[PDB]
RNA sequence: GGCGUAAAGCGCACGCAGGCGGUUUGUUAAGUCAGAUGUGAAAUCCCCGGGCUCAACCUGGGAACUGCAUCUGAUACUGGCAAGCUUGAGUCUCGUAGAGGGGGGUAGAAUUCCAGGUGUAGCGGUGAAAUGCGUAGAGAUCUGGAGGAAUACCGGUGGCGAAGGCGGCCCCCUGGACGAAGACUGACGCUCAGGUGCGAAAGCGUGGGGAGCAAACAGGAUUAGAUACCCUGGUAGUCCACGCCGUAAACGAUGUCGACUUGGAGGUUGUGCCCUUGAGGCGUGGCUUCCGGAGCUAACGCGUUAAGUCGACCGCCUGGGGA
């Protein structure tokens, strides 16, 4: 998974403080974080369907958390999306 | 009944905690060394109404059938059965006893007639072969059916000991309506009974205590 | 998940009586409170008390006769799956008058004849026999 | 009304539409409820009478027409809206166990083959035989080499994985689960038609590889026959890379999620406490095996890992054949 140090990095980035690591936006950066690391995995290991399952899980859970927030405050969504490159 | 003279009588001692029955917790005090311990404060006062019961029973012209058949409280039971003109079951308790007495009836006055004619009969008609087969189907007779002899009918109250030990008795009471006062340990199943007292039920002396309290309780009824 | 918590108010009692449970505890919940005052006004609980600020929890003492269960038979009839209302003429009787119904009537939560009493109909909470 | 065995749980999972949804406050009055109004044609149905000499029949009045719309109120529950809360659901910290997955390397035992030494008449196989190999030197034994496949002991109603499955050792990449004490977000949840993904073995395509085993095939037996079981060989295949196939008694013949309900003996993996006496005792979680209580079941049996008591959603069944 991300090391410590990158995990703290996206928490203070993310987040309304240090210790805030339960927020939708820290939630999701993290999320994004670690498929975009498991994507240079998979390049390379297209036959690794175990691990896929989790990357999938992974984007599934980001997914839902997305709209949630989307849902609940828009523009904190838009903040986001446009902070991580998602959209498609 | 004093709870001193049961505590020093071994009375608060269970089985081991493996084969509790769930259904004798309320009468469970704890555990030690990984056997159970018999609340006292729970065993003295259902012994002392189960002994009201049983002077009730005594005083209203009732008949007392003690039941308990473990190597342990076999000699005891005879002796508290005899010690107040009672009756007894001190060894294997034939299946029907009491559902089937118009069976075992027969069987009593098989015995009653081969001991007259054994004792007061004296046929002295030997041949030294149906003689002995006789008298040793006397004494089978009468380590079976010795205590119910005298009996006539079916009884009023039935004492047993080790309620798990004679479910037998405890089932055939319970259909013929009979009341039941059971000491009940902690392995034995407390359903069946009416008066369960919680106490231990192997060691002779816990035996000894609740028969001679029994006795007292029935003599005491009996002489009104 | 959790997605009906009256009847699993009912399923609570049903077991616990089952059981010969004493009392029985579960998270409490203003509409849970009012049909247990429905029940205890009616006789099937002895008593309940709600214990806790943040996370109240609802305590029911159950009710026993001759070592026998008081409440023999409860049933929820409106249910998340399937809404169930009636009006005051259709008001059902449970037992044929000796069970009651339990009834979200406009003016609170009340039995079936007190709904009746009172000219109302509403959500068939339960059935207690 | 059902789906363990009688027909019936998709092989497993992710997930859009849909269905349902913890808890508190306020507000609305959409569902819900109450009242009133309008309407609900007549006949028919039903009730009390009347006329046909009775009946059928005709007929007066009533009830009914369980419905729809409108208006006025109620606010408990469901819904909408707004603000919350932490117990459901997640994030972070530190550790733990594991044949979880993908890639590369390597080790030993054994089979087969090649070359050589010793050595001589058998070997192999079977119920018994024969086919087969062998005086061109087999089998046995010893030495060296080649190649492929699988990993003895550990090893265990043991462990991991959604399922299918996963077993030498090492390294690289990587998923999930669990536990301790906290902090954080604040219903973000459950299920899921269609959809997508994974999916034993066999099989297919391309390119390799090929020791052992072995469909087809050949021969020897057995037999009345023997297109078989048994024996001697043996091609595809089994192995690797990449695609396809999408099926199994894919089984727990038992869908997923959550709550509640007496016990006993174990296994495995964390964690806490105590002169730690001890490989100790006492608690507290996760997964797991056997027995068994109430209950349930047609019975067998299941039984806190339910086939018990419930709730949400989905799939499926409607006599046997045809099929």
Known sequence: SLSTEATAKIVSEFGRDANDTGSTEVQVALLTAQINHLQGHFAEHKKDHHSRRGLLRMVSQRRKLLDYLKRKDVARYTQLIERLGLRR | ?????????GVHFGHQTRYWNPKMKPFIFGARNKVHIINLEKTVPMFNEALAELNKIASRKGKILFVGTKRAASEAVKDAALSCDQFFVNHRW??????????????????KDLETQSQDGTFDKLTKKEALMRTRELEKLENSLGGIKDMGGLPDALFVIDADHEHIAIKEANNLGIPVFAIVDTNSDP?????????????????????????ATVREGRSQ | SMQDPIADMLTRIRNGQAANKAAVTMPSSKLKVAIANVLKEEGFIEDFKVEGDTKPELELTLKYFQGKAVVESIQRVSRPGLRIYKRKDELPKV??????AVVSTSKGVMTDRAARQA????????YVA
């Open chain 2, 1 to 9: 009944v004093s709870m001193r003279d049961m505590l020093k009588a």
């Open chain 2, 94 to 111: 034939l299946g029907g006893m009491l559902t089937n007495w118009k069976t075992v009836r027969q069987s009593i006055k098989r015995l």
């Open chain 2, 191 to 215: 359903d069946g009974v009416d008066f369960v007292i919680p106490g231990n039920d192997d060691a002779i002396r816990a035996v000894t205590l609740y028969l001679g309290a029994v006795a």
């Open chain 3, 95 to 100: 037992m044929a008058g000796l069970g009651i």
């Open chain 3, 119 to 126: 000219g109302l109909g509403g959500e068939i909470i339960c």
